[PDB]
Ligand binder design. Structure first.
Ligand SMILES: CCCCCCCCCCCCCCCC(=O)O
Lengths: 57, 238, 268, 256, 238, 125, 57
């Protein structure tokens, strides 16, 4: 059961990976996980604030 | 036995290598995961959060909480300069220890805009107007308010909202500017001036203070991760 | 992919993007275009090195110890702790809670030690590393029954080839590893206080399987840690201080930052 | 119409009303909630005292002086002897709860000062002596505020928390406390600060007496200062309300 | 010859490794399998079986069969304590040598409920009521019957069925408690009290005995298998 | 099969098991229940400690002698300092609760005695 | 004839294995055989007993 994935390349090409162990802890790291969400740390406050309105009214 | 050749570099150890190796314990049952608040997926998200700036980092002031405070007072003549600091976050003493600066000490290249936030901390009666300016590289640092106005600037008024944001546009020939100071790329000069004299009623203090907050903008990015300069050990700790 | 700036044109308006309140604690989020006229620029920049996994996926040497083929100190024992190396400790400290698989590489180098004995002949040394879980009997001497390792994971290495490598599943009684614990070992609150209270990862023992030659040989074993499949939560500020012990966070007091000559001056 | 500044919070039989406030902060965007059955390690049914435990409790006020390094409270210790909530934890081996924090300071328009109200998970204070861990009495103050010291603790060979303000006791820069959830009280703009905290911990439930989850800290970045003849005493009051408090492991009272 | 690279750790020996190696004898014809009773697939099933508990393990009693027996007698005042032992099966002296305890000495972590079974061994005429209680950790061990009643307990009556089961609920902050004693996790305190005085007719003995049986419940589990502490050899046996 | 005499009652974390018992008595044929909204005088929400308060509590035993006139207990006073239930009433101005009573005496076949266990509303001494 | 099987992973991912020998005694161990039945050792007695009935009647 071979898996085909994209490679890390520049902008302005696939690598085959096969698991040979069943421990699942013997796999490679998940380097390609480019997801971010600053909503927790920034804009923590309950009532939402618009970009251009008086902050306190 | 299939015939095989051995590549150069066989049996070598690379710090940054990604390979498959056999587990010490077979079929271990890992403890189940549970929901935890403030989950982190990217370092940049931590840098977006504002960090207090020790702008007055001179002498005894770093030892007290006076480092963060910037002094302001009513003055006879308008046009005096409140403060001046280097644009780059990584090398400059003023931004080196801040959240964004500490993350940058870890990475060799840095890119994108910086947001600076200024909050007046004086009495309600106190009023004033200040001019916050950024001057593009290759021009001597502004020595007068007229020179500073030529560089892009935001005029701020105290009262109503008590905080202002000066956003420094990225203006670099290169896509990436080195975190380490570089002769080739100079980030810029950031300076503040009195647009008008501070005015206060009798029984209100003449002199107030202004705190500064520094953060990465949405366009900001980093590359070439490297060991940080600040952390060192003479011996293993016990 | 990094967000790309939008082109803007001059306008006079009631709206006030630059004006905001620090007191709310909601970080201001304003683009360069709101403050000044800008031009439409596309960005191909990628936030692909700031990911927590990329930042913490590199081998670092947590600790090294020395043992002798002859003399009183036959074998070396090290308790398994992340804290004793500053670089590994500082990056782990960046998150309060971390969950991660561990990759272990051991590098062993043997140096001949000068001696009065002559015409020494040295057969290739073989080195045994054995890991004991809490409450496993400790070896008291190098020739002990404990060295059989029937119930204990163990690796045998012959000098002159690739360093031995193993993968470790996430081992914790807890759902996540705790970088900082604000707690006492007992209910009374009189006793040791610190992260050392949650410290029970076991101990590692290294010995010469055999002695090739009469002369004394000293072997150094270096242990390397590489986080894998990393998961983080509750981020913490940068430490900002030199470390003092691996059992506590006790610190000599430190100035906030390096000092410039004047507020106006651009020189550090 | 309505005002963003005006607010009214009602928990149990206690209601809080401030004419002026900065927008309320939820620290990680998560409301406090009761524990899931899927995530629950303990088989025995939990006991939920409901409104009894979940009410505002007012602590002893402190005096803001022109030279006060700082004031800090261990929150679990703060409510350890207060009402049914103090009684339930003493009775039960395991407790998990959300916490509501409300810090109120009142001053004349002429007064000028800025206080930083930050709640930090797992803050570990470090002893002034390197070879000794900090004492429990120094670490936690029951019924009384514990105060930061502007100067570093002097050389010593005894248990003693290191209280220098810039390190904040954690040996980390004071300015970077922004990453922890926080709310700024500026005398010109804000009357009081409200922070709501989701329960945070690696384990789903933990014994409250042995372990403290979060620590409320107040530090003035800008000193209080006023012209002569103005009120010279300023009072800061901390009110804390438990949220969705639940208890397990019914046991004989007291800790040892 | 296909090009190949050699991974770090090539030519190394791991005790717990699973690989394919060539048989010493090719195509051996193995002897046919036959049906055998009591086939075993899991260690836990052996731990589920009840094991007699040497509760009275003091002095000479371990040397005699008196270790297992627990003494009881008619007494002037109700409320006296029959016995007290630590909750954990692995470290405690009382449960260390039992079936479940011996299996646990092999594994580093343990999880789930324990069933304790108590069988009265007195004359038919003899009658009595006892209170068996488990007290949750972080509370000093109960010193009186009133304190013991606060902890979860089962009141037992002699006569009709002659055996009772007290099931100890798992009450741990952690999913797994270390088999080795841990300061962080304390299993609990288990104690017995006289609900009422033992009553006997004339010509019937005042004093009787009570045996205790300990077993793993359905929810019980183990992890991190390790070498056992008890078995050691000075030299290979002949 | 089953026995009328054998019984097992489980309340909270306390379980009571007697091999021989007389049929259980409900005094007026009414099970204890929480108060109705239709019948409730007080506006404020009530607090229900659930299993904490609702568990068996064991009192100090007495000695039955050949000449003991009698023993009597005021039940609300009996549980006034016992566990969370003693704490809740001390904290709160109003409390209403059902009560389970279980009286246990053990004797040899040869022994002979008869005890009357009666609960009386509003007894005034 | 490659065989694809599941790996050992946590709760709340496949490994390929190919046999290169015909001795059949050269294969890997069957670690993933999670089947248990205490019925033999516990509840040995002929007549079945219900959880809540008198044990002897
Ligand atoms: C067989 C030789 C190797 C033995 C490896 C034993 C397992 C070591 C695991 C160490 C994990 C450290 C995690 C971070 C620090 C901590 O939480 O204690």
């Amino acid at each position: 059961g071979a898996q085909v994935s994209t490679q890390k390349t520049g902008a302005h090409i696939h690598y085959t990976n096969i698991n040979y162990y069943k421990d699942a802890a013997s796999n490679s790291a998940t380097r390609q996980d480019f997801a971010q969400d600053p909503g927790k740390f920034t804009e923590p406050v309950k009532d939402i604030m618009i970009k251009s309105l008086p902050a306190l009214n | 036995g299939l015939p095989t050749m051995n590549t150069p570099g066989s049996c070598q150890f690379l710090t940054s290598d990604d390979f498959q190796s056999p587990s010490a314990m077979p079929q271990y049952d890992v403890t189940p995961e549970m929901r935890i608040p403030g989950e982190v997926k990217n370092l940049m998200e931590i840098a977006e959060v504002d960090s207090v700036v020790p702008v007055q980092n001179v002498g005894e002031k770093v030892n007290s909480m006076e480092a963060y405070q910037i002094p302001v007072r009513s003055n006879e003549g308008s046009g005096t300069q409140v403060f001046g600091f280097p644009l780059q976050p990584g090398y400059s003493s003023v931004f080196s220890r801040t959240l964004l600066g500490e993350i940058l000490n870890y990475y060799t290249h840095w890119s994108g805009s910086i947001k600076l936030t200024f909050m007046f901390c004086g009495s309600a009666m106190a009023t004033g107007k200040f001019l916050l300016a950024y001057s593009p590289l290759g021009a001597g640092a502004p020595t007068k308010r007229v020179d500073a106005m030529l560089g892009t600037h935001v005029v701020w008024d105290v009262g109503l909202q008590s905080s202002c944001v000066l956003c420094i546009p990225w203006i670099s020939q290169t896509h990436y500017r080195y975190v380490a100071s570089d002769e080739c790329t100079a980030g810029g000069f950031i300076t503040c001036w009195y647009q008008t004299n501070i005015v206060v009623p009798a029984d209100a203090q003449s002199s107030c203070y202004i705190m500064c907050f520094v953060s990465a903008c949405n366009d900001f990015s980093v590359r070439l991760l490297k060991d940080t300069p600040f952390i060192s050990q003479e011996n293993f700790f016990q | 992919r990094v967000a790309d700036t939008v082109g803007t044109g001059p306008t006079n308006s009631e709206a006030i993007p630059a004006l905001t309140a620090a007191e709310t604690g909601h970080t201001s989020q304003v683009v360069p275009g709101d403050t000044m006229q800008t031009r439409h620029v596309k960005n191909y920049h990628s936030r692909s090195e700031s990911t927590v996994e990329n930042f913490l996926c590199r081998s670092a040497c947590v600790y090294f110890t020395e043992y002798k083929n002859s003399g009183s100190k036959r074998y070396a024992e090290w308790v398994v702790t992340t804290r004793q190396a500053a670089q590994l400790r500082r990056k782990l400290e960046f998150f309060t809670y971390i969950r991660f698989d561990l990759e272990l590489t051991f590098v062993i180098t043997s140096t001949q030690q000068p001696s009065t004995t002559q015409n020494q002949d040295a057969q290739i040394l073989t080195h045994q590393i054995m890991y004991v879980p809490p409450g496993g009997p400790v070896p008291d001497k190098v020739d002990s029954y404990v060295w059989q390792t029937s119930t204990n994971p163990s690796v045998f290495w012959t000098e002159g080839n690739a360093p031995p490598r193993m993968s470790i599943p996430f081992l914790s009684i807890g759902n996540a590893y705790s970088n900082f614990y604000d707690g006492w070992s007992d209910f009374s609150r009189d006793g040791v206080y610190g992260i050392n209270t949650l410290n029970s990862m076991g101990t590692l023992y290294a010995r010469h399987v055999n002695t090739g030659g009469t002369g004394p040989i000293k072997s150094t074993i270096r242990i390397y840690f590489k986080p894998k499949h990393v998961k983080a939560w509750i981020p913490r500020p940068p430490r900002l201080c030199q470390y003092e012990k691996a059992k506590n966070v006790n610190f000599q007091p430190s100035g906030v930052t390096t000092t410039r000559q004047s507020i106006t001056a651009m020189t550090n | 119409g309505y005002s963003d500044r005006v607010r009214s919070i009602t928990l149990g039989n206690s209601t809080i009303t401030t004419q002026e406030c900065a927008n309320v902060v939820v620290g990680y965007g998560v409301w406090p909630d009761y524990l899931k059955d899927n995530e629950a390690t303990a088989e025995d049914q939990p006991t939920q005292p409901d409104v009894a435990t979940c009410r505002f409790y007012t602590l002893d006020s402190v005096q803001w002086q022109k030279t006060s390094p700082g004031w800090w409270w261990k929150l679990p210790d703060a409510l350890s002897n207060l009402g049914l909530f103090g009684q339930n934890m003493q009775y039960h081996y395991l407790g998990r709860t959300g916490y509501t924090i409300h810090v109120q300071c009142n001053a004349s328009k002429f007064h000028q000062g800025c206080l930083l109200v930050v709640c930090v998970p797992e803050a570990e204070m470090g002893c002034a002596t390197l070879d000794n861990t900090p004492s429990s009495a120094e670490l936690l103050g029951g019924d009384a505020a514990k105060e930061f010291a502007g100067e570093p603790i002097a050389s010593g060979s005894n248990k003693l928390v290191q209280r220098v303000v810039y390190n904040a006791g954690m040996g980390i820069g004071v300015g970077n406390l922004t990453i922890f959830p926080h709310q700024w009280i500026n005398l010109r703009t804000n009357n009081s600060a409200t922070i709501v905290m989701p329960y945070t911990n690696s384990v789903p439930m933990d014994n409250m007496f042995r372990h403290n989850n979060v620590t409320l800290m107040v530090i003035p970045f800008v000193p209080l200062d006023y012209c002569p003849g103005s009120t010279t005493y300023v009072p800061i009051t901390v009110t804390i309300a438990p949220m969705n408090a639940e208890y397990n492991g019914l046991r004989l009272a007291g800790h040892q």
